[PDB]
């Protein structure tokens, strides 16, 4: 019985190194898909075709705590405020959002990119706020401790720092 | 000893990893819709409405309507259910229920004897989010829910 | 040391269990690519329509039969919602297992029969012997399994995706 | 008292642990799903040819490698329409793709033909199966586990499905 | 009493032996259900080591040059990382200073065009790559893309048919595209 465990013991952490390698082909699913991950960067564009519609990349934020007050700061590229946006009460978790690519005045923003700053309290005391921007999967690399994703521009990142899928 | 104590905290880092794998499979659920605890009921576009469901671990079921306000709607008797899970999809005149949000609520007796009856609300995939005890589903509007509080998927 | 050692095979036992009941759940995540697709089912029921469009031509719900045995004579009787005989179908010879047919939605005079939901009966034997045959019926998959109309069945009970 | 109970129990897990096994062929049925729209390479000699005119692709088994590889096909008639010097292969499974052109540089008419393959090894003569492809439209239920449906060609096991295309 | 107490031991260790292969089974048919999800790798493309890289145009007018994304897998972080591109004539046709990187896998697209600013013609080109670490010259392993064409069964494990290319294992594939 003292050997028998033991053999058993090291079965187990065998069979765990066999879950990994479906890991890895499980992670090319979300090839196509995109991501949210840590950021502020939000891009703008128009369509090829004539009446198209801008649109902007979508994003995020992640809370410890909830808060009351939500604000999102929009600038451009010279770091001008393009936008500030005023989004609600918000409880601890993944929060994602979607800018509708119009600045106060209610114009249409030209094309490029964008970044946020979010500032969120709960009765005036201020928190810690993870700012989330859309970044798309292009790929799955081979790391040395385990499978990365390839957002391309944003670079690389590993799965445990994605906070949401979509 | 010593090995014992070892094959929790391996068969540990297994749970964890299998229902991490769930949760890159949940991505196949994004665009689809579940069913999961809840009694809400949106409409939207002949009219159609959000399913609703209850779950029995009973030979008489009726199930009342309440509207926003607080009035009560319709109740259809269409007949008694097994065990397991089950879900379905006007005013009580005939009239067309206005645009908005509904409640549900369910009684469920075994010869008039009542039980416990959880009613059943659908969600749309909008997401997968990353929890504190587990990996979640976003539902969007309704919030997050894990898998095994999924009772049918749409 | 025992002590220690049985109250940690106890939660071992419990994890394990956890383990068993996870993998159900991600075995439906798994069904659910099959709501844009049909299945195969144990039932009797075919339906037949037209469409709007001029040159539409008549459809089958299509059927089948499983078999536990081979059998030589293998006949299927197709009966109307009033229990008259529309059609009589000679198959043919059947090795043991499922095999799937369409009906080309003409009954015995040669017409095509209206819109609506016939029932069949399929009678198997070998060498004058008589076997169980189990008739099967064509569902079209609305979640997760929930076929609509037809109802709820598990995926076991599913003879063949289409 | 526990004797009888672990002779149960461990029939018990069985019983439970069977299901498992077949909860998992129905997972693989819903990969197989997938697998319909494209087919596999299987047992055959078999290749079709229809409207530029293509061809089903076909292949070869070896168990050794060869420096001698031809592949022969013919017509419905038995008549020879081309003869393939393809190249060399080391042991597996290859799989390859027919122009659909006859010797002459010309296009065979639509219809089905047929492949032979000899593979030697410095004129020694190597055991070679040939493949042919086969369309999946569904997936089909046996008595000892999960099926696939070819159609025409009928059903195979899985393990014998020899490339997956 | 005896005779039933042996009974329902061999039943016992009859079931124990039962259930192994009955396991043999599962372990059998998780193999194979890792085969089926490979098959979501069939339509996909993969960075397996080489050097080769392809270019082309569309049977469309106006149509623009692209070329199959090529890739380098280090050991240790290099600061200097050059890529020199030919053809199959032999003559340089494109250098590429790729900068710094860290250890691991990184790839690129070229953009088809050579040094003195034209396209090159459709065809095929080779990458060489060498990497250093403050002078210190590092091993470098470059990679081509290879589009997945089909799973196939070898004799010991499942491989990936790249076509051209050949077959692979999966753990020789540095990314999936």
């Known amino acids: 019985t003292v050997s028998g465990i033991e053999k058993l013991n090291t079965t187990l952490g065998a069979i765990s190194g066999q879950i990994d390698?479906?890991?890895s082909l499980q992670a090319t699913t979300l090839i196509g898909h995109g991501v949210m991950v840590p950021g502020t960067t939000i891009l703008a564009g128009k369509g090829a075709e004539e009446g198209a519609?801008?649109?902007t990349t979508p994003f995020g934020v992640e809370l410890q705590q909830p808060a009351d007050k939500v604000t999102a700061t929009?600038?451009?590229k010279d770091g001008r405020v393009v936008r500030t946006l005023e989004i609600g009460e918000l409880r601890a978790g993944?929060?994602?959002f979607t800018?509708?690519?119009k600045q106060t005045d209610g114009t249409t923003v030209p094309n490029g990119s964008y970044n946020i700053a979010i500032t969120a309290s709960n009765g005036?005391?201020?928190l810690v706020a993870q700012p989330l921007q859309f970044a798309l999967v292009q790929g799955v690399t081979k790391g040395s401790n385990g499978n990365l994703?390839?957002?391309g521009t944003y670079?690389?990142?590993?799965l445990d720092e994605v906070r949401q899928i979509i």
Do not use: A, M, P, Y
């Open 21 to 23: 390698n479906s890991q």
């Open 53 to 55: 519609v801008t649109s």
């Open 74 to 76: 929009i600038t451009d």
């Open 94 to 96: 993944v929060h994602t």
């Open 99 to 101: 800018w509708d690519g």
């Open 124 to 126: 005036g005391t201020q």
């Open 149 to 151: 994703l390839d957002l």
């Open 155 to 158: 670079g690389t990142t590993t």
